[PDB]
């Protein structure tokens, strides 16, 4: 079904590095240069106040829509990743349901400016106070802290490409039917990421990468906060939240 479902040679691992970085470049959503350039476009105090005066439900709806847009690029990244389309559909869905949000959270560090603790949202950079109307301050603070910690690693685009491929191809996800195929693909993507780090003298980041439990905790908090919002505004979720968002985070 795929070369990377068995043992790959050094030349084949080098080919895998190029392939992953290409799949990522084609599906990165926003170019890094475009995010960096917009760092000087920051929401004013008046604009921050305007966001804080928005209703909780309208802010939740806008954030769900923007997250869904980011998730659609992750689905395309997965489709272009070597081996992914050769997995069975059950496994493709298991991996995307568990990992799409984790990849979005990792990618989001590119849109986070550690100098002033702001994130790119709706055309400008804003601090965590911009999202106060959501009523999930702990989750926002945790996402900002996570982004701050990844920003301190100074990831290159190729490092994000290889690291996010591994975040997605996790053979430990419950529900995988072809677990051994996923393990071999994950082993080869791990070799590709570690080969690239070795070649670029960046192996010091391996001990500094966040534990898997960290991305899991952020995803669990997101689902928990959504359940609280859904109990308050059930018809907003039913009528105005994107269907893909609901399939991933609220069971349909």
């Amino acid at each position: 079904e795929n070369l990377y479902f068995q043992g790959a040679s050094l030349t084949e691992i080098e080919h895998l590095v190029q392939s992953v970085c290409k799949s990522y470049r084609e599906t990165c959503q926003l170019r890094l240069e475009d995010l960096l350039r917009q760092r000087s476009n920051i929401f004013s105090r008046e604009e921050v106040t305007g966001y804080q005066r928005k209703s909780m439900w309208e802010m939740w709806e806008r954030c769900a829509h923007h997250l869904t847009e980011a998730i659609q690029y992750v689905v395309e990244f997965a489709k272009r990743l070597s081996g992914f389309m050769e997995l069975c559909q059950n496994d493709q869905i298991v991996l995307l349901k568990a990992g799409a949000m984790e990849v979005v959270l990792v990618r989001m560090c590119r849109a986070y400016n550690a100098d002033n603790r702001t994130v790119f949202f709706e055309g400008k950079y804003g601090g965590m106070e911009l999202f106060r109307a959501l009523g999930c301050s702990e989750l926002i603070s945790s996402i900002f802290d996570f982004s701050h910690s990844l920003s301190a690693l100074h990831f290159s685009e190729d490092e994000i490409a290889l690291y996010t491929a591994l975040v997605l191809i996790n053979a430990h996800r419950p529900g995988l039917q072809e677990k051994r195929k996923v393990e071999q693909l994950q082993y080869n993507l791990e070799l590709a990421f570690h080969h690239h780090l070795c070649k670029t003298h960046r192996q010091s980041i391996l001990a500094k990468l966040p534990p898997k439990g960290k991305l899991r905790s952020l995803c669990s908090q997101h689902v928990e906060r959504l359940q609280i919002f859904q109990h308050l505004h059930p018809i907003v979720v039913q009528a105005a939240f994107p269907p893909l968002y609901k399939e991933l985070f609220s069971g349909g």
Binding site: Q72, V75, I93, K97, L244, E247
Partner: peptide
């Protein structure tokens, strides 16, 4: 019971 993932995966 929204099911968009299978559609996105199947669309080429």
């Amino acid at each position: 019971k929204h099911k968009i993932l299978h559609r996105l995966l199947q669309d080429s």
